[PDB]
Amino acid sequence: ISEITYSDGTVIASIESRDYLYFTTLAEAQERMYDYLAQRDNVSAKELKNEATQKFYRDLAAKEIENGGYKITTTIDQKIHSAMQSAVADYGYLLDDGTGRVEVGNVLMDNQTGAILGFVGGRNYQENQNNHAFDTKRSPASTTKPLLAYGIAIDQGLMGSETILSNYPTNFANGNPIMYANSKGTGMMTLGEALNYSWNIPAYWTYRMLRENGVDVKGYMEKMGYEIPEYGIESLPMGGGIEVTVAQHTNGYQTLANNGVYHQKHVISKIEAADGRVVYEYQDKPVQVYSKATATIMQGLLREVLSSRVTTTFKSNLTSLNPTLANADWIGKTGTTGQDENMWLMLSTPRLTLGGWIGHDDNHSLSQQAGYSNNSNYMAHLVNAIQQASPSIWGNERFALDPSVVKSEVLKSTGQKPGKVSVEGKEVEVTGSTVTSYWANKSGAPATSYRFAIGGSDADYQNAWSSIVGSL
Amino acid sequence: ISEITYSDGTVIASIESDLLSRDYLYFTTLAEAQERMYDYLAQRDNVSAKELKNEATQKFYRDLAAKEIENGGYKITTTIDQKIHSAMQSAVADYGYLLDDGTGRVEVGNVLMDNQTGAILGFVGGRNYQENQNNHAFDTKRSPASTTKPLLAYGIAIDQGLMGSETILSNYPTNFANGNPIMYANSKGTGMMTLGEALNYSWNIPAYWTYRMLRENGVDVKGYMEKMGYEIPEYGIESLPMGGGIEVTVAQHTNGYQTLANNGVYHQKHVISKIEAADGRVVYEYQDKPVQVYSKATATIMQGLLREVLSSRVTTTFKSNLTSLNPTLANADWIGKTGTTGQDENMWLMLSTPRLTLGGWIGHDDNHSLSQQAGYSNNSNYMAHLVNAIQQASPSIWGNERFALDPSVVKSEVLKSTGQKPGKVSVEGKEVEVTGSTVTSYWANKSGAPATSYRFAIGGSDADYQNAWSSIVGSL
Ligand SMILES: *[B-](O)(O)[C@H](C)NC(=O)c1c(F)cccc1F
Ligand SMILES: *[B-](O)(O)[C@H](C)NC(=O)c1c(F)cccc1F
Ligand SMILES: [Cl-]
Ligand SMILES: [Cl-]
Ligand SMILES: [Cl-]
Ligand SMILES: [Cl-]
Ligand SMILES: [Cl-]
Ligand SMILES: [Cl-]
Ligand SMILES: [Cl-]
Ligand SMILES: [Cl-]
Ligand SMILES: [Cl-]
Ligand SMILES: [Cl-]
Ligand SMILES: [Cl-]
Ligand SMILES: [Cl-]
Ligand SMILES: [Cl-]
Ligand SMILES: [Cl-]
Ligand SMILES: [Cl-]
Ligand SMILES: [Cl-]
Ligand SMILES: [Cl-]
Ligand SMILES: [Cl-]
Ligand SMILES: [Cl-]
Ligand SMILES: [Cl-]
Ligand SMILES: [Cl-]
Ligand SMILES: [Cl-]
Ligand SMILES: [Cl-]
Ligand SMILES: [Cl-]
Ligand SMILES: [Cl-]
Ligand SMILES: [Cl-]
Ligand SMILES: [Cl-]
Ligand SMILES: [Cl-]
Ligand SMILES: [Cl-]
Ligand SMILES: [Cl-]
Ligand SMILES: [Cl-]
Ligand SMILES: [Cl-]
Ligand SMILES: [Cl-]
Ligand code: NA
Ligand code: NA
């Protein structure tokens, strides 16, 4: 008889010939066994591409585990995962709104190891077996923005923490206006406002700039396990052309939280043969995906995404349920797809990341505040439930700017050092309030240029610069 | 022995002569009972309120009243609901610490009031009677700040037919008469905005312009305030609508919000409902004196706006705090307003459902500043706990009713950009066809909203209007 265990060695079940925990851990055990048998049999790369061969090797892995005498060690923490099960059972109903039963997926990951400590597969496996933590793929919407746009622009030294971006009206190449909610745009805006409010236009110019600088955006995303088939898409940074599991996407956030270092997500740490020989064991392959300056600058922006409360009530929800816990150093980001079909809230302290999705299995609209309110309230309860079952697991550490970060005094108005600039004839002495801007390059921000923001048409600049000029 | 009872007859305390009932409840109810006996004794003796103006006569009648209750056979019936009041004492004891924000021990006052009677069902008098006896529900007077706005500014203007729900006001930079800018936090202003936005964000300049309009129309603003029992010594103050020159108890202020919530009909606050002598003489009994302060159309339009103050969550996390503690209660029909004095010395949050109004203030006894989020967050979280404690003790007390527009309300189709009906306007030579998005705007007059004219907003300079009209013609 084979057995699957929790991280401490406690048997989950034995395998032979009714919850997520079983089928998820079994499924991944079987994946690891498949790689092992394919390697053991020296099956070539090209054979493994053949579908009849996959079927055979999948069936062999299943049988091997039924018939072998394997001990399979998972990353799962029995008390935590258990408390998450109870949390979804007790508080799942918070997610229901006008729109039918709202399904849900959550993944609690260790930021230092990528191990998964526990998860919510859905509202109630007995009613609905689909696994919303591991199998469901949905656009991550604006939770894309920190990873693929802003993070990468900072890492490449093309922007800093208080850099300015255009949220002026602009159209996609088809002539349609880029929209956010029901707004065509406003004007210039700091990266912090862009992120707190989740505006779309800033993210659109950010990606566009990366593309014009020839930046290897695919390299970044692939080092995190992301598979995006087409990068040549205007709305990519807003979630367009991307679909991900909660498990994979929680790994993107783990990378930001873990100071820019990726660790591959996993639920199985080891498989042992009857005799004791290691058939599979998880090997740490940390990767510095974003520089420490970049990750830690982003941690600071993401802390404010939550404390500003603009697109999620979370910090308020949690404060009411557990004010001590609410004082941990939470950072995060919300997502909402275009018709409110899917909501995401990703949360991290320095120790842990908690990814969260909700939506309907057949992809129809949630209520309008499903993500802003319902999901945030639910997650605050989940997060409390994890705390009760494992009271120091969240930790009390703060995120903190790496020493390699560079600090620049810049004009609040331009995101850039004070300077002479040419404004149509007349050269101006650009003056006004300064802020500390954080950069992940060598030299900090540049001097103020005419084209000071990320994005913006001529007209936009004319407009922005006349108010700047207006207040000197 | 005289006796002070809860509303149901349970004895709060007996009153004897002192040698030569350690709580806010005791002193508060005795203090009002004595005032009631004072009025009765002065009348019984037939003393004029030119005589009652003389200060030895006051002293005499106060001393007389105390002894009357000390030595007499009096049953005093309070309005205090025991199980509710007791839950509120437990709530401030258990959750009071949520208020301490680094600036010291933060003091607190609350009053729960029945909107259809003015009866005070319970109150919190401070953090802990034993530690500090100042009664922060009944005695303490502080500026109500921006919770002044709905009563003294927007509600009167709507009542007077001078604005409706989607009317536009100037938040453009303007100065006080002394030349200093009118500030809101660190902002010197923005541009035009709807009433609802003005209310959600609590901006100052729209409120200044609103009261200036009432003055210019010679509205009897004092008449309104005084019918709700407010005593403001000086109305000629530019910052009155923002709370400049007004100081109120929590108990009085709750009564103003009880007016708005009860469809514009005031009932005077009271904690004493009846005093009888052992011999049958009913010395005092509370008489209902309804006063229609705002029209029902005004009060119900105001309710709609204050619903959104809370649910927008701009100046208070209350609806979020409460959702997490009790989602079912959070779905009751909450309306309300926040206030913050200019150095964060005093935070107010006023809450209603159709049945009840709960007033709340926090600050320090010496008036120093709280932290910056004390009102936005700490007070809102504290009060969600309080509201929830009050519910658990009396599960139906908040009610499931909804606020709703009175059928006398007048609905108008207006431009979102102007708050006024679509049509032609003269913009500097060019007569222009004003077109665009419309909303339904609610009024409390006969004929609804006017046609758009050049000066479409409450407030604004020539410059401001140039700039807003400039913006409007790029749409069309
Ligand atoms: B974001 O706050 O989730 C914002 C609403 N993002 C989007 O608009 C967006 C998607 F969620 C998915 C594809 C494209 C897109 F612009
Ligand atoms: B309001 O949101 O409380 C707003 C801040 N009000 C004021 O600034 C204000 C006062 F609270 C008191 C007197 C004047 C004044 F402008
Ligand atoms: Cl499970
Ligand atoms: Cl375990
Ligand atoms: Cl790429
Ligand atoms: Cl992926
Ligand atoms: Cl490409
Ligand atoms: Cl795994
Ligand atoms: Cl680094
Ligand atoms: Cl916070
Ligand atoms: Cl909130
Ligand atoms: Cl469905
Ligand atoms: Cl909880
Ligand atoms: Cl830091
Ligand atoms: Cl510098
Ligand atoms: Cl550099
Ligand atoms: Cl230009
Ligand atoms: Cl242009
Ligand atoms: Cl008391
Ligand atoms: Cl009672
Ligand atoms: Cl002044
Ligand atoms: Cl007056
Ligand atoms: Cl008063
Ligand atoms: Cl006057
Ligand atoms: Cl009384
Ligand atoms: Cl008698
Ligand atoms: Cl009426
Ligand atoms: Cl709400
Ligand atoms: Cl509570
Ligand atoms: Cl209604
Ligand atoms: Cl009508
Ligand atoms: Cl009409
Ligand atoms: Cl009229
Ligand atoms: Cl003008
Ligand atoms: Cl002017
Ligand atoms: Na969002
Ligand atoms: Na306020």
mmCIF file of all heavy atoms in Angstrom, chain A residues 93-94 197 307-309 313 316-321 323 369 372-373 377 381, chain B residues 97-98 201 311-313 317 320-325 327 376-377 381 385:
data_model
loop_
_atom_site.group_PDB
_atom_site.id
_atom_site.type_symbol
_atom_site.label_atom_id
_atom_site.label_comp_id
_atom_site.label_asym_id
_atom_site.label_seq_id
_atom_site.Cartn_x
_atom_site.Cartn_y
_atom_site.Cartn_z
ATOM 1 N N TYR A 93 -20.205 31.522 2.138
ATOM 2 C CA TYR A 93 -21.460 32.200 1.776
ATOM 3 C C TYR A 93 -21.274 33.709 1.627
ATOM 4 O O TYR A 93 -22.100 34.377 0.998
ATOM 5 C CB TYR A 93 -22.558 31.917 2.800
ATOM 6 C CG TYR A 93 -22.400 32.736 4.065
ATOM 7 C CD1 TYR A 93 -23.151 33.903 4.253
ATOM 8 C CD2 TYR A 93 -21.532 32.328 5.115
ATOM 9 C CE1 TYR A 93 -23.016 34.682 5.421
ATOM 10 C CE2 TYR A 93 -21.412 33.118 6.320
ATOM 11 C CZ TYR A 93 -22.134 34.313 6.428
ATOM 12 O OH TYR A 93 -22.057 35.148 7.556
ATOM 13 N N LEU A 94 -20.205 34.263 2.196
ATOM 14 C CA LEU A 94 -19.939 35.707 2.043
ATOM 15 C C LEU A 94 -19.725 36.110 0.590
ATOM 16 O O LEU A 94 -19.809 37.310 0.245
ATOM 17 C CB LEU A 94 -18.724 36.145 2.878
ATOM 18 C CG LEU A 94 -18.900 35.961 4.373
ATOM 19 C CD1 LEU A 94 -17.590 36.144 5.121
ATOM 20 C CD2 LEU A 94 -19.932 37.007 4.821
ATOM 21 N N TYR A 197 -5.354 52.802 -7.850
ATOM 22 C CA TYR A 197 -6.621 52.975 -8.519
ATOM 23 C C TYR A 197 -6.776 51.960 -9.648
ATOM 24 O O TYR A 197 -7.872 51.779 -10.174
ATOM 25 C CB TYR A 197 -6.753 54.406 -9.071
ATOM 26 C CG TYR A 197 -7.258 55.412 -8.038
ATOM 27 C CD1 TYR A 197 -6.418 55.895 -7.048
ATOM 28 C CD2 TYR A 197 -8.586 55.865 -8.047
ATOM 29 C CE1 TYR A 197 -6.876 56.776 -6.072
ATOM 30 C CE2 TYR A 197 -9.072 56.726 -7.037
ATOM 31 C CZ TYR A 197 -8.192 57.184 -6.081
ATOM 32 O OH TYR A 197 -8.616 58.046 -5.108
ATOM 33 N N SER A 307 -3.496 49.668 1.875
ATOM 34 C CA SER A 307 -3.787 50.678 2.892
ATOM 35 C C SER A 307 -4.614 51.809 2.318
ATOM 36 O O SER A 307 -5.590 52.201 2.951
ATOM 37 C CB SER A 307 -2.518 51.166 3.621
ATOM 38 O OG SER A 307 -1.648 51.840 2.733
ATOM 39 N N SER A 308 -4.402 52.170 1.050
ATOM 40 C CA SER A 308 -5.300 53.151 0.397
ATOM 41 C C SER A 308 -6.785 52.709 0.269
ATOM 42 O O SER A 308 -7.698 53.551 0.175
ATOM 43 C CB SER A 308 -4.762 53.541 -0.978
ATOM 44 O OG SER A 308 -5.077 52.551 -1.958
ATOM 45 N N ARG A 309 -7.028 51.399 0.269
ATOM 46 C CA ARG A 309 -8.392 50.862 0.276
ATOM 47 C C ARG A 309 -9.224 51.203 -0.934
ATOM 48 O O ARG A 309 -10.425 50.994 -0.934
ATOM 49 C CB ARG A 309 -9.118 51.240 1.566
ATOM 50 C CG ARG A 309 -8.550 50.523 2.803
ATOM 51 C CD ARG A 309 -8.768 51.349 4.025
ATOM 52 N NE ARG A 309 -8.691 50.592 5.283
ATOM 53 C CZ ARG A 309 -7.645 50.620 6.102
ATOM 54 N NH1 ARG A 309 -6.503 51.220 5.745
ATOM 55 N NH2 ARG A 309 -7.726 50.017 7.269
ATOM 56 N N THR A 313 -11.563 46.587 0.264
ATOM 57 C CA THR A 313 -11.855 46.865 1.691
ATOM 58 C C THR A 313 -11.041 45.997 2.686
ATOM 59 O O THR A 313 -11.250 46.057 3.917
ATOM 60 C CB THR A 313 -13.369 46.725 1.986
ATOM 61 O OG1 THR A 313 -13.779 45.360 1.828
ATOM 62 C CG2 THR A 313 -14.146 47.524 0.964
ATOM 63 N N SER A 316 -9.482 47.073 6.207
ATOM 64 C CA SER A 316 -10.621 47.378 7.103
ATOM 65 C C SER A 316 -11.294 46.100 7.593
ATOM 66 O O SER A 316 -11.583 45.971 8.780
ATOM 67 C CB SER A 316 -11.679 48.220 6.363
ATOM 68 O OG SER A 316 -11.125 49.430 5.873
ATOM 69 N N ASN A 317 -11.575 45.172 6.668
ATOM 70 C CA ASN A 317 -12.197 43.895 7.023
ATOM 71 C C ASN A 317 -11.381 43.192 8.087
ATOM 72 O O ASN A 317 -11.917 42.746 9.083
ATOM 73 C CB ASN A 317 -12.314 42.973 5.799
ATOM 74 C CG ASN A 317 -13.223 43.539 4.735
ATOM 75 O OD1 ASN A 317 -12.855 43.601 3.552
ATOM 76 N ND2 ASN A 317 -14.388 44.041 5.151
ATOM 77 N N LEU A 318 -10.069 43.115 7.875
ATOM 78 C CA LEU A 318 -9.191 42.338 8.723
ATOM 79 C C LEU A 318 -9.034 43.049 10.064
ATOM 80 O O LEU A 318 -8.863 42.402 11.109
ATOM 81 C CB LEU A 318 -7.833 42.130 8.051
ATOM 82 C CG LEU A 318 -6.823 41.346 8.872
ATOM 83 C CD1 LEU A 318 -7.312 39.911 9.212
ATOM 84 C CD2 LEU A 318 -5.518 41.285 8.069
ATOM 85 N N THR A 319 -9.166 44.372 10.044
ATOM 86 C CA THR A 319 -8.872 45.161 11.229
ATOM 87 C C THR A 319 -9.957 44.826 12.178
ATOM 88 O O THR A 319 -9.700 44.601 13.357
ATOM 89 C CB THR A 319 -8.863 46.667 10.929
ATOM 90 O OG1 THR A 319 -7.671 46.961 10.205
ATOM 91 C CG2 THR A 319 -8.856 47.492 12.213
ATOM 92 N N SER A 320 -11.177 44.749 11.662
ATOM 93 C CA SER A 320 -12.326 44.431 12.514
ATOM 94 C C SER A 320 -12.284 42.987 13.052
ATOM 95 O O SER A 320 -12.765 42.708 14.149
ATOM 96 C CB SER A 320 -13.622 44.692 11.758
ATOM 97 O OG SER A 320 -13.859 46.086 11.546
ATOM 98 N N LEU A 321 -11.809 42.044 12.252
ATOM 99 C CA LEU A 321 -11.735 40.677 12.738
ATOM 100 C C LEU A 321 -10.555 40.420 13.624
ATOM 101 O O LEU A 321 -10.673 39.602 14.503
ATOM 102 C CB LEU A 321 -11.642 39.701 11.594
ATOM 103 C CG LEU A 321 -12.817 39.778 10.652
ATOM 104 C CD1 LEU A 321 -12.490 38.834 9.452
ATOM 105 C CD2 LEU A 321 -14.062 39.278 11.421
ATOM 106 N N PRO A 323 -7.246 42.884 14.929
ATOM 107 C CA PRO A 323 -6.524 44.151 14.721
ATOM 108 C C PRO A 323 -5.009 43.940 14.804
ATOM 109 O O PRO A 323 -4.265 44.574 14.086
ATOM 110 C CB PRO A 323 -6.988 45.046 15.878
ATOM 111 C CG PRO A 323 -8.116 44.336 16.551
ATOM 112 C CD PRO A 323 -8.312 43.001 15.947
ATOM 113 N N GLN A 369 -19.407 44.728 -6.802
ATOM 114 C CA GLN A 369 -18.534 44.872 -5.649
ATOM 115 C C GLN A 369 -18.029 43.518 -5.152
ATOM 116 O O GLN A 369 -17.550 43.420 -4.023
ATOM 117 C CB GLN A 369 -19.287 45.574 -4.522
ATOM 118 C CG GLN A 369 -19.938 46.880 -4.932
ATOM 119 C CD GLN A 369 -18.937 48.009 -4.946
ATOM 120 O OE1 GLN A 369 -18.183 48.179 -5.918
ATOM 121 N NE2 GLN A 369 -18.859 48.739 -3.832
ATOM 122 N N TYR A 372 -14.223 43.997 -4.664
ATOM 123 C CA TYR A 372 -13.870 45.132 -3.806
ATOM 124 C C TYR A 372 -14.286 44.848 -2.370
ATOM 125 O O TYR A 372 -13.490 45.025 -1.400
ATOM 126 C CB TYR A 372 -14.502 46.425 -4.350
ATOM 127 C CG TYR A 372 -14.602 47.575 -3.369
ATOM 128 C CD1 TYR A 372 -13.520 48.378 -3.109
ATOM 129 C CD2 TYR A 372 -15.806 47.857 -2.714
ATOM 130 C CE1 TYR A 372 -13.615 49.471 -2.251
ATOM 131 C CE2 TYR A 372 -15.911 48.938 -1.865
ATOM 132 C CZ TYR A 372 -14.799 49.724 -1.625
ATOM 133 O OH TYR A 372 -14.851 50.755 -0.715
ATOM 134 N N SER A 373 -15.484 44.286 -2.245
ATOM 135 C CA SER A 373 -16.016 43.963 -0.922
ATOM 136 C C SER A 373 -16.076 42.451 -0.565
ATOM 137 O O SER A 373 -15.434 42.004 0.390
ATOM 138 C CB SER A 373 -17.385 44.605 -0.684
ATOM 139 O OG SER A 373 -17.733 44.354 0.688
ATOM 140 N N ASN A 377 -13.613 40.673 2.158
ATOM 141 C CA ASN A 377 -14.145 40.241 3.455
ATOM 142 C C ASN A 377 -13.849 38.739 3.682
ATOM 143 O O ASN A 377 -13.333 38.330 4.731
ATOM 144 C CB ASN A 377 -15.651 40.530 3.551
ATOM 145 C CG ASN A 377 -16.248 40.148 4.907
ATOM 146 O OD1 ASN A 377 -15.622 40.332 5.947
ATOM 147 N ND2 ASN A 377 -17.466 39.631 4.894
ATOM 148 N N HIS A 381 -11.351 36.836 6.571
ATOM 149 C CA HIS A 381 -11.709 35.653 7.388
ATOM 150 C C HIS A 381 -10.786 34.467 7.155
ATOM 151 O O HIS A 381 -10.416 33.767 8.086
ATOM 152 C CB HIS A 381 -13.126 35.174 7.070
ATOM 153 C CG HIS A 381 -14.203 36.003 7.685
ATOM 154 N ND1 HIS A 381 -14.831 37.019 7.000
ATOM 155 C CD2 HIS A 381 -14.800 35.938 8.896
ATOM 156 C CE1 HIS A 381 -15.722 37.595 7.791
ATOM 157 N NE2 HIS A 381 -15.723 36.957 8.946
ATOM 158 N N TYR B 97 -10.363 50.035 23.584
ATOM 159 C CA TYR B 97 -8.937 50.094 23.242
ATOM 160 C C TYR B 97 -8.723 50.315 21.740
ATOM 161 O O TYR B 97 -7.683 50.823 21.320
ATOM 162 C CB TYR B 97 -8.195 48.841 23.733
ATOM 163 C CG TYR B 97 -8.446 47.625 22.862
ATOM 164 C CD1 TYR B 97 -7.511 47.231 21.911
ATOM 165 C CD2 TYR B 97 -9.645 46.909 22.951
ATOM 166 C CE1 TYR B 97 -7.730 46.135 21.088
ATOM 167 C CE2 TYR B 97 -9.868 45.808 22.140
ATOM 168 C CZ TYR B 97 -8.895 45.413 21.218
ATOM 169 O OH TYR B 97 -9.149 44.361 20.349
ATOM 170 N N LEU B 98 -9.715 49.973 20.925
ATOM 171 C CA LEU B 98 -9.588 50.194 19.482
ATOM 172 C C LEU B 98 -9.388 51.658 19.119
ATOM 173 O O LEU B 98 -8.936 51.959 18.029
ATOM 174 C CB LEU B 98 -10.773 49.629 18.711
ATOM 175 C CG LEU B 98 -11.006 48.132 18.875
ATOM 176 C CD1 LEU B 98 -12.395 47.772 18.333
ATOM 177 C CD2 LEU B 98 -9.882 47.323 18.192
ATOM 178 N N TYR B 201 -16.844 63.148 -0.102
ATOM 179 C CA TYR B 201 -15.464 63.552 0.233
ATOM 180 C C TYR B 201 -15.423 64.600 1.360
ATOM 181 O O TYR B 201 -14.363 64.916 1.889
ATOM 182 C CB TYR B 201 -14.774 64.130 -1.000
ATOM 183 C CG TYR B 201 -14.320 63.061 -1.957
ATOM 184 C CD1 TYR B 201 -15.251 62.394 -2.780
ATOM 185 C CD2 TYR B 201 -12.984 62.661 -1.990
ATOM 186 C CE1 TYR B 201 -14.861 61.365 -3.616
ATOM 187 C CE2 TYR B 201 -12.569 61.588 -2.808
ATOM 188 C CZ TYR B 201 -13.503 60.984 -3.641
ATOM 189 O OH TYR B 201 -13.086 59.985 -4.488
ATOM 190 N N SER B 311 -21.496 54.169 2.116
ATOM 191 C CA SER B 311 -21.225 53.042 1.217
ATOM 192 C C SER B 311 -20.093 53.401 0.251
ATOM 193 O O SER B 311 -19.340 52.516 -0.132
ATOM 194 C CB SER B 311 -22.488 52.587 0.478
ATOM 195 O OG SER B 311 -22.833 53.582 -0.469
ATOM 196 N N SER B 312 -19.874 54.689 -0.019
ATOM 197 C CA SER B 312 -18.659 55.097 -0.763
ATOM 198 C C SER B 312 -17.382 54.873 0.044
ATOM 199 O O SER B 312 -16.321 54.719 -0.519
ATOM 200 C CB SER B 312 -18.749 56.571 -1.207
ATOM 201 O OG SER B 312 -18.341 57.447 -0.164
ATOM 202 N N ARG B 313 -17.467 54.864 1.373
ATOM 203 C CA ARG B 313 -16.291 54.550 2.201
ATOM 204 C C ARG B 313 -15.125 55.515 2.026
ATOM 205 O O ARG B 313 -14.020 55.255 2.494
ATOM 206 C CB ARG B 313 -15.792 53.111 2.025
ATOM 207 C CG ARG B 313 -16.701 52.006 2.602
ATOM 208 C CD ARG B 313 -16.742 50.904 1.605
ATOM 209 N NE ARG B 313 -17.102 49.589 2.112
ATOM 210 C CZ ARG B 313 -18.241 49.010 1.784
ATOM 211 N NH1 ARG B 313 -19.110 49.683 1.037
ATOM 212 N NH2 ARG B 313 -18.527 47.800 2.200
ATOM 213 N N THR B 317 -14.499 53.867 7.128
ATOM 214 C CA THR B 317 -14.443 52.437 6.772
ATOM 215 C C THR B 317 -15.632 51.682 7.404
ATOM 216 O O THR B 317 -15.740 50.469 7.281
ATOM 217 C CB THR B 317 -13.097 51.831 7.256
ATOM 218 O OG1 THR B 317 -12.983 51.969 8.683
ATOM 219 C CG2 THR B 317 -11.910 52.600 6.630
ATOM 220 N N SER B 320 -17.418 48.652 5.855
ATOM 221 C CA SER B 320 -16.502 47.515 5.741
ATOM 222 C C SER B 320 -16.310 46.818 7.079
ATOM 223 O O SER B 320 -16.442 45.600 7.153
ATOM 224 C CB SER B 320 -15.148 48.005 5.254
ATOM 225 O OG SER B 320 -15.326 48.680 4.029
ATOM 226 N N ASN B 321 -15.960 47.595 8.117
ATOM 227 C CA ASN B 321 -15.844 47.106 9.496
ATOM 228 C C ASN B 321 -17.066 46.298 9.903
ATOM 229 O O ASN B 321 -16.974 45.171 10.428
ATOM 230 C CB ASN B 321 -15.712 48.308 10.433
ATOM 231 C CG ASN B 321 -14.453 49.120 10.157
ATOM 232 O OD1 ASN B 321 -13.363 48.549 9.964
ATOM 233 N ND2 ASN B 321 -14.588 50.459 10.131
ATOM 234 N N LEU B 322 -18.232 46.861 9.623
ATOM 235 C CA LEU B 322 -19.476 46.210 10.008
ATOM 236 C C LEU B 322 -19.832 44.972 9.188
ATOM 237 O O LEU B 322 -20.373 43.984 9.742
ATOM 238 C CB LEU B 322 -20.653 47.202 10.089
ATOM 239 C CG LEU B 322 -22.009 46.629 10.542
ATOM 240 C CD1 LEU B 322 -22.071 46.257 12.028
ATOM 241 C CD2 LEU B 322 -23.043 47.662 10.250
ATOM 242 N N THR B 323 -19.582 45.022 7.882
ATOM 243 C CA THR B 323 -19.701 43.795 7.073
ATOM 244 C C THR B 323 -18.916 42.622 7.667
ATOM 245 O O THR B 323 -19.428 41.503 7.850
ATOM 246 C CB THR B 323 -19.253 44.067 5.632
ATOM 247 O OG1 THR B 323 -20.144 45.032 5.106
ATOM 248 C CG2 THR B 323 -19.368 42.811 4.747
ATOM 249 N N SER B 324 -17.710 42.904 8.128
ATOM 250 C CA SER B 324 -16.885 41.812 8.617
ATOM 251 C C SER B 324 -17.408 41.297 9.974
ATOM 252 O O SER B 324 -17.266 40.129 10.292
ATOM 253 C CB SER B 324 -15.424 42.242 8.685
ATOM 254 O OG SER B 324 -14.867 42.344 7.376
ATOM 255 N N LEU B 325 -18.015 42.169 10.775
ATOM 256 C CA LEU B 325 -18.520 41.765 12.087
ATOM 257 C C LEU B 325 -19.918 41.170 11.968
ATOM 258 O O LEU B 325 -20.234 40.217 12.673
ATOM 259 C CB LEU B 325 -18.546 42.940 13.068
ATOM 260 C CG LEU B 325 -17.191 43.564 13.429
ATOM 261 C CD1 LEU B 325 -17.406 44.810 14.278
ATOM 262 C CD2 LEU B 325 -16.357 42.565 14.215
ATOM 263 N N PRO B 327 -22.493 40.866 8.583
ATOM 264 C CA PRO B 327 -22.959 41.180 7.229
ATOM 265 C C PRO B 327 -24.453 41.372 7.154
ATOM 266 O O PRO B 327 -24.929 42.248 6.421
ATOM 267 C CB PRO B 327 -22.533 39.970 6.399
ATOM 268 C CG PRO B 327 -22.045 38.922 7.396
ATOM 269 C CD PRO B 327 -22.163 39.440 8.786
ATOM 270 N N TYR B 376 -11.468 58.146 10.533
ATOM 271 C CA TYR B 376 -11.639 57.403 9.287
ATOM 272 C C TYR B 376 -11.647 55.915 9.619
ATOM 273 O O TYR B 376 -12.571 55.173 9.237
ATOM 274 C CB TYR B 376 -10.487 57.752 8.312
ATOM 275 C CG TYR B 376 -10.354 56.775 7.165
ATOM 276 C CD1 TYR B 376 -11.210 56.843 6.068
ATOM 277 C CD2 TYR B 376 -9.399 55.758 7.187
ATOM 278 C CE1 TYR B 376 -11.102 55.927 4.961
ATOM 279 C CE2 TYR B 376 -9.251 54.858 6.080
ATOM 280 C CZ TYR B 376 -10.131 54.947 4.998
ATOM 281 O OH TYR B 376 -10.041 54.056 3.951
ATOM 282 N N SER B 377 -10.744 55.529 10.516
ATOM 283 C CA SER B 377 -10.592 54.114 10.846
ATOM 284 C C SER B 377 -10.924 53.696 12.290
ATOM 285 O O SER B 377 -11.868 52.943 12.481
ATOM 286 C CB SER B 377 -9.212 53.602 10.469
ATOM 287 O OG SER B 377 -9.191 52.238 10.806
ATOM 288 N N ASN B 381 -14.376 51.627 13.341
ATOM 289 C CA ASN B 381 -14.237 50.233 13.734
ATOM 290 C C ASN B 381 -14.874 50.107 15.112
ATOM 291 O O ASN B 381 -15.780 49.310 15.312
ATOM 292 C CB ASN B 381 -12.761 49.831 13.810
ATOM 293 C CG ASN B 381 -12.585 48.351 14.065
ATOM 294 O OD1 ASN B 381 -13.455 47.550 13.721
ATOM 295 N ND2 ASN B 381 -11.520 47.986 14.745
ATOM 296 N N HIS B 385 -18.291 47.802 16.179
ATOM 297 C CA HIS B 385 -18.398 46.934 17.336
ATOM 298 C C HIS B 385 -19.578 47.319 18.218
ATOM 299 O O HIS B 385 -20.353 46.447 18.639
ATOM 300 C CB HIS B 385 -17.078 46.894 18.138
ATOM 301 C CG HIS B 385 -15.988 46.148 17.441
ATOM 302 N ND1 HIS B 385 -15.737 44.815 17.667
ATOM 303 C CD2 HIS B 385 -15.095 46.550 16.505
ATOM 304 C CE1 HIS B 385 -14.760 44.415 16.867
ATOM 305 N NE2 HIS B 385 -14.309 45.468 16.203
#
